[PDB]
Amino acid sequence: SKVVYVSHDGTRRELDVADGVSLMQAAVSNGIYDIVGDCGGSASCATCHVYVNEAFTDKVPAANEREIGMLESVTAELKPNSRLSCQIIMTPELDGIVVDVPDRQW
Numbered sequence: 001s002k003v004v005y006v007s008h009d010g011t012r013r014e015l016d017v018a019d020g021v022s023l024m025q026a027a028v029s030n031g032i033y034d035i036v037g038d039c040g041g042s043a044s045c046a047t048c049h050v051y052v053n054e055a056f057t058d059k060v061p062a063a064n065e066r067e068i069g070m071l072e073s074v075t076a077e078l079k080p081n082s083r084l085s086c087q088i089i090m091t092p093e094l095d096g097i098v099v100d101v102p103d104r105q106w
């Protein structure tokens with residue numbers, strides 16, 4: 001399934017992500033270092049922060065308590081559509097989803 005990562009400078013990168021893989025795993029596995037899973041993907045850091053395109057913000061599963069609490073630690077601006085990419089798990093239903101990588105993760 002397709003996932004589009006948009007850098008701060010507008011650079012777009014499209015990856016084919018398998019079912020069950022998180023957006024953080026796909027990013028780090030394909031050189032999108034601007035996203036770094038410091039904690040390893042267990043919602044214990046905020047370095048995998050991304051902005052889910054408003055066209056998918058209400059499709060993807062809502063953030064749980066752990067994520068909501070960890071989001072307050074993001075270094076970039078915390079927007080309404082801010083999410084931790086390690087919490088977004090790919091499925092065919094998310095094909096075409098677009099996420100913007102923040103200017104910084106620290």
Ligand code: FES
Binds near residue numbers: 038039044045087
């Ligand atoms: S990789 Fe640590 S919260 Fe996502």
